[PDB]
Amino acid sequence: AHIFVKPELVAEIGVKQLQREIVLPGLVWTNPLTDFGGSKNDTITVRVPAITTA
């Protein structure tokens, strides 16, 4: 029978892998403490004030 030699075409019709929408990083508390360098063991230990009872 008739046999033809043809290329193998490749196209990008816009399909892809569906992925999550980024929401979480904009919500949590980011960077209250910055000077991690210049502190022992990379720790910026936060103080919490004292309360008392009468």
Partner: protein, 48 residues
């Protein structure tokens, strides 16, 4: 062979069926609903 002979099996058909990308679907008129054909669950090839 002869121009009046029945048409031979198309090599393009043979290759197309070998690649196995012809769409297979469940029959509409079948109760209970048929199971998903094996072709419809084929994972995407990792290259060309």
């Amino acid at each position: 062979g002869l121009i009046s002979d029945p048409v031979e099996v198309d090599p393009i058909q043979v290759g197309r069926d070998e690649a196995g990308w012809v769409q297979e679907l469940r029959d509409r008129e079948a109760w209970p609903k048929q199971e998903v054909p094996e072709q419809a669950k084929k994972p995407a090839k990792v290259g060309n």
